[PDB]
């Protein structure tokens, strides 16, 4: 199998940058290498066909090149919806090989996030369960640190985070933190709280609410 | 030109699944149809591909006497039968084409069928709002959403008022709890002064269960 080494696995620029992605193809592939792009939760979409041309209605700040068994996608001027992840790939014999893409991520100026909780509903309450959320909206950069207090008892093991990819116009991060109780838990305590803490923020920014 | 897969769902360890590729605005006689799955955040991986017109095909090692790929060309329609699954091939699974005037690449790809090869039963999703209240406020901002809980298996999809509000949402990726079921929330922020005027409700969708849910979601 005809390996393509991508590199680098990540890669993180500003608007306007150029970006160069390589593939080096283990074995002369000639000019068969084609470059996707993936889109979170989308199919990939071919960028560059036969290592160098563009494939129609493709934006001419992406282009392709080939230097023996070494291919290149560069993206000339870096924009905010080029956050996806690349692939190469080589058809010159079967099996067709991927690279293990590169993930590539916009830089941006540090944006804080806005903060809001929100308390288990009635009909999850009646059902014998509490999962309490926090939401951290539209932030940068994505490394945020959420934690539970309850009556102020710092919380372990029972909350799951999710983060948003970053957004295509204004490459901000959003960040969802669950905690989970029984009802009967739940109905223990009086002040759930949610505290933040980011690089935009002064000092932790704490959400709270009062049971009842 | 379009490429639309269907068959895909939950299968038990050892299970078979036949997925199928429905060709539109080309005939498959004259390309080469490609099979390439993705497992759950991980990258790219051939499978797969097959030239309709002799038959002639050809299969990855990780699949190679377990999958087989065909074709029907007067339906248009190539096929993924997948025998003896296992928990490895869980994974998106894209067809794809080799065509045009000289590309030779895969110009055109269906939007792909989640195949999810596990001991565990179909379980539809409860949705619960998440009420914008005075401390869902930020100046004139107010955030809501809804909770997306107990589901199994991936995926569901959530829109907003039928589709009619899209910015300022963000559905986040689902993830699995201790439970060995996923759970979501997609939220959404609005001006503040919108909150006892406009509607919202979100529709959550999880074809694996048939399950459509519309859930109205009330400033408390």
């Known amino acids: 199998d005809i390996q393509m080494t991508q590199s680098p696995s990540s890669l993180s620029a500003s608007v306007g940058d150029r970006v160069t992605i390589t593939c080096r193809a283990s074995?002369?592939?000639?000019?068969?290498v084609a470059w996707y792009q993936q889109k979170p939760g989308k199919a990939p979409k071919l960028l560059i066909y036969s290592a160098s041309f563009l494939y129609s209605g493709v934006p001419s700040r992406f282009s392709g090149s080939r230097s023996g068994t070494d291919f290149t996608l560069t993206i000339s001027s870096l924009q905010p919806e080029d956050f996806a992840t690349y692939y190469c790939q080589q058809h010159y014999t079967t099996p067709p090989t991927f690279g293990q893409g590169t993930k590539v991520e916009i830089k941006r100026t540090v944006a804080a996030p806005s903060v809001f909780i929100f308390p288990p509903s009635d009909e999850q309450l009646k059902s014998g369960t509490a999962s309490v959320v926090c939401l951290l909206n539209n932030f940068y950069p994505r490394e945020a640190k959420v934690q539970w207090k309850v009556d102020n008892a710092l919380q372990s093991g029972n909350s799951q985070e999710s983060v948003t990819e970053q957004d295509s116009k204004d490459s901000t991060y959003s960040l969802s933190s669950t905690l989970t109780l029984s009802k009967a838990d739940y109905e223990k305590h009086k002040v759930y709280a949610c505290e933040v803490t980011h690089q935009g923020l002064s000092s932790p920014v704490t959400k709270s609410f009062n049971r009842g | 030109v379009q490429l639309v897969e269907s068959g895909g769902g939950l299968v038990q360890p050892g299970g078979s699944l036949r997925l199928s590729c429905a060709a539109s605005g080309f005939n498959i006689k004259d390309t080469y149809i490609h099979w390439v799955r993705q497992a759950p955040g991980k990258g790219l991986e051939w499978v797969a591909r097959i030239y309709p017109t002799n038959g002639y095909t050809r299969y990855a090692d990780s699949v190679k006497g377990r999958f087989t790929i065909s074709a029907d060309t007067s339906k248009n329609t190539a096929y993924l039968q997948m025998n003896s699954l296992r928990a490895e091939d869980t994974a998106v699974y894209y067809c794809?084409?080799?065509?045009?005037?000289?590309?030779?690449?895969?110009?055109?790809w269906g939007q792909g069928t989640l195949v999810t090869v596990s001991s565990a039963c179909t379980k539809c999703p409860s949705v619960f709002p998440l009420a914008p209240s005075s401390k869902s406020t930020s100046g004139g901002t107010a955030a809501l959403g809804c909770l997306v809980k107990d589901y199994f298996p991936e995926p569901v999809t959530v829109s907003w008022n039928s589709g009619a509000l899209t910015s300022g949402v963000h559905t986040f990726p689902a993830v699995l709890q201790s439970s060995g079921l996923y759970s979501l929330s997609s939220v959404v922020t609005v001006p503040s002064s919108s909150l006892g005027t406009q509607t919202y409700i979100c529709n959550v969708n999880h074809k694996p269960s048939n399950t459509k849910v519309d859930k109205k979601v009330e400033p408390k």
């Open positions: 074995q002369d592939v000639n000019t068969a």
């Open positions: 794809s084409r080799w065509g045009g005037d000289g590309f030779y690449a895969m110009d055109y």
